[PDB]
Design a protein around this ligand. Structure first.
Ligand SMILES: [Ca+2]
Length: 223
């Protein structure tokens, strides 16, 4: 997360670290057996780590649960990054308490102007590299569709929204990918892509979760 602050241990109870030997992406717990992440984070052999804060030190609140199956959106396109959303079913139900909890899915889409919390263990530098060991947090407003389409001409589909700062210096980044964008206690987005990180006039782009609620509920009821 570039230009963010340390969240503090287990203050973001729905945040998950996806690990295949090393933390590679984040994700969000939506019920005790299912995680939502980004389809660009797909790989085989994912272990979901819940209850994390320092991802390099076992501190007492972790649950590491292997996934049973991963489902990429039927219409995911990796070249345009449209429909960048994937479901991960866990092998056992997780145990939910205040430090590990699920987040609600949206009933209504969020308007531009709404301030959201974005969090993850991705890169913290705009130039160069530095990956933190403890979870970072960023508050950022959803931008209007016209600032977003004017920053990324020809790239924004109806399933994408921008959030962040046009002046730069504060953004999500590589590694926060698949992580949560929470606004008024509902999951509204998934960290998806951007041009670099924290560049002037290049805000973060996020998968618009309210467009996916019926696919998520139907998939969960049948799998
Ligand atoms: Ca840990």
């Amino acid at each position: 997360i570039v230009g963010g602050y340390t969240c503090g241990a287990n203050t973001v109870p729905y945040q998950v670290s996806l690990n295949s030997g090393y933390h590679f992406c984040g994700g969000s717990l939506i019920n005790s057996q299912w995680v939502v992440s980004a389809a660009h984070c797909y790989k085989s052999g994912i272990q979901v780590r819940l209850g994390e804060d320092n991802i390099n030190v076992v501190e007492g609140n972790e649950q590491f649960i292997s996934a049973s199956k991963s489902i990429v959106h039927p219409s995911y396109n990796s070249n345009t990054l449209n429909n960048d959303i994937m479901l991960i079913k866990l092998k056992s139900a997780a145990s939910l308490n205040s430090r590990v909890a699920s987040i609600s899915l949206p009933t209504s889409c969020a308007s531009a102007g709404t301030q959201c919390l974005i969090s993850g263990w991705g890169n913290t530098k705009s130039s160069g590299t530095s990956y933190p060991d403890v979870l970072k947090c960023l508050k950022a407003p959803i931008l209007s569709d016209s600032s977003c389409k004017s920053a990324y001409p020809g790239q924004i589909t109806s399933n994408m929204f921008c959030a962040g700062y046009l002046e730069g210096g504060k953004d999500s980044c590589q590694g926060d990918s698949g992580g949560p964008v929470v606004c008024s206690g509902k999951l509204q987005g998934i960290v998806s892509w951007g041009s670099g990180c924290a560049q002037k006039n290049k805000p973060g782009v996020y998968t618009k979760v309210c467009n996916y609620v019926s696919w998520i509920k139907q998939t969960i009821a049948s799998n």
